A paper describes a structure:
One example where the lack of enzyme regioselectivity limits potential commercial productivity is the engineered biosynthesis of the flavor and fragrance agent vanillin 2 a.3 Catechol‐O‐methyltransferase ([name]) has been used to methylate 3,4‐dihydroxybenzaldehyde (DHBAL, 1 a) and 3,4‐dihydroxybenzoic acid (DHBA, 1 b) in engineered strains of Escherichia coli and fission yeast for the production of vanillin 2 a from glucose. Structural and mechanistic information suggest that the regioselectivity of [name] can be attributed to the concerted action of a “hydrophobic wall” found in the active site of the enzyme, and the substrate properties.
The X‐ray crystal structures of dimeric [name] and WT [name] revealed that a key residue (E199) had been flipped out of the active site. We rationalize that in the WT monomeric enzyme, E199 can form a hydrogen bond with the aldehyde group of 1 a, thereby leading to some para‐methylation, whereas in dimeric [name] and WT [name] the absence of E199 from the active site results in the aldehyde group orientating towards the solvent, thereby leading to meta‐methylation. However, the re value for [name] monomer (ca. +90 %) suggests that in the absence of dimerization, the [name] mutation alone is sufficient to cause loss of E199 interaction with the substrate. Since monomeric [name] is as regioselective as the dimeric forms (ca. +90 % re), we suggest, based on the structural data for the [name] and WT dimers and the regioselectivity assay data for both oligomeric forms, that loss of para‐methylation is largely due to movement of E199 out of the active site, as a consequence either of mutagenesis ([name]) or protein dimerization and domain swapping (WT). Active‐site modifications thus appear to cause significant shifts in regioselectivity independently of the enzyme oligomeric state. Finally, we demonstrated potential applications for our improved [name] variants by regioselectively alkylating 1 a by using ethyl, allyl, and benzyl [name] analogues generated enzymatically or synthetically.11 Products 4 a–c were obtained with re values of approximately +90 % with [name] compared to +33–45 % with WT [name].
Author numbering:
A (entry chain A), B (entry chain B): 46 to 258
The structure:
């Protein structure tokens, strides 16, 4: 089996179907105690959660699904009738994502788009009936953040107020993208500093309440 | 200089005087980005916080102060009239702890005792007219947890309801202590699983809001 198949199996064993919180917690545990994986992670996930709650987007685009962790994070906070589209070019990853969404009970709010962003973004208006996007989460290969931002602009998919949220602008880093959006009057930028989710060591406290001799 | 001098300087440089929360955050930042140190840490510190809030102890004894991190955590949550005694054998560390508490503005709630727990525990009743303790936090050298627990009992410092809270019962581990309190009818035990505070890698998200062409 693969790492992504092992993550899904761990979720199926330990999380609760229909409970997105339990799914996030199970992936967090597996990927900090058993095998590291490139999910956005809990620390940066809290920041993502706050951006979703603040802007209450009706239509979100995610670039890079992997196993569905960030899709589960975002979709569980969407208002009724709000939607997430997520693009993923690795079909085995997309297959895991679909199963993860089904387990979490969020499959009716998320649509997986199979293929590469450079091929699918130009299809959003015609094939998927998108007018403009309310929010875009960028988390795919880092050398594509800037070209896809420019493609979204050229295709007329952004409007005033559309929120781009980009992972990993420090590590592995996206210096061309950062230079562009920070230097351009077309974007108002805010940086949110945080941490990667690396492997951890389990420890514990014991509470012992004295009962008398 | 020493690691503990560098930690204290980083706090004085970056935290707000009189603000315990800012002091904790500065220590967290230094000891996860610059140099690891044996503080209880933020994850286990949240559990400590919850125990303090649940039992609202009027008299707390801490075994092992180091730089004052856990003393700041506990003292900032103590109610009016409550006090913390902390024992620290290392005079250099005891001095750092005093400066740390002074900076945080918590010095009037904490009394530092500079000596070894096995020497000072039998003197608490005579030197401070202690009757019994409401809570004990054990976080000193791990081979002393069991003998100091037995000494606290012998010297009459525990009452029915006194809460012992022990750090590191998994890593580095306190197997004799754990076997004793879990096995003994004199203690009712609860385990709180958590994680060590190891070094982290800074990353961040960028929020870029589109304004138009
Ligand atoms: C870091 S992972 C996604 C993690 C996910 N956002 C999360 O937080 O759970 C990166 C993903 O992007 C996919 N990918 C990379 N370039 C892509 C592109 N141009 N179009 C679509 N998917 C892409 C990869 O196959 C991979 O699954
Ligand atoms: C892990 S550190 C304490 C960390 C502190 N509780 C915190 O979370 O910020 C251990 C400390 O215990 C002190 N120590 C070890 N054995 C002791 C003893 N028998 N009596 C008093 N202090 C002791 C050491 O000098 C050291 O500073
Ligand atoms: O190597 N990493 O720490 C990461 C982290 C990440 O969050 C990534 O998205 C990533 N990637 O897409 O290649 C790599
Ligand atoms: O080595 N460690 O990870 C630790 C952690 C700790 O929390 C400790 O208290 C410690 N010690 O007192 O020696 C050591
Ligand atoms: Br691929
Ligand atoms: Mg990422
Ligand atoms: Mg400790």
């Amino acid at each position: 089996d693969t790492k992504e198949q092992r993550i899904l199996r761990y979720v199926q064993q330990n999380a609760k179907p229909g409970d997105p919180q339990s799914v996030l917690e199970a992936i967090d545990t597996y990927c900090t105690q058993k095998e590291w994986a490139m999910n956005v992670g809990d620390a940066k996930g809290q920041i993502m959660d706050a951006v979703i709650r603040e802007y209450s987007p009706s239509l979100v685009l995610e670039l890079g699904a992997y196993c569905g962790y960030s899709a589960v994070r975002m979709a569980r906070l969407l208002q009724p009738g709000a939607r997430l589209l997520t693009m993923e070019m690795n079909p085995d990853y997309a297959a895991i994502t679909q199963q993860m969404l089904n387990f979490a009970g969020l499959q009716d709010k998320v649509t997986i788009l199979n293929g590469a962003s450079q091929d699918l973004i130009p299809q959003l208006k015609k094939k998927y009936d998108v007018d403009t996007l309310d929010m875009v989460f960028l988390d795919h290969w880092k050398d594509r953040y800037l070209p896809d931002t420019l493609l979204l602009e050229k295709c007329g998919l952004l409007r005033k107020g559309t929120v781009l949220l980009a992972d990993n602008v420090i590590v592995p880093g996206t210096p061309d993208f950062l230079a562009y959006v920070r230097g351009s009057s077309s974007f108002e930028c805010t940086h949110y500093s945080s941490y990667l989710e690396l492997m951890k060591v389990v420890d514990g406290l014991e509470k012992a309440i004295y009962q008398g001799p």
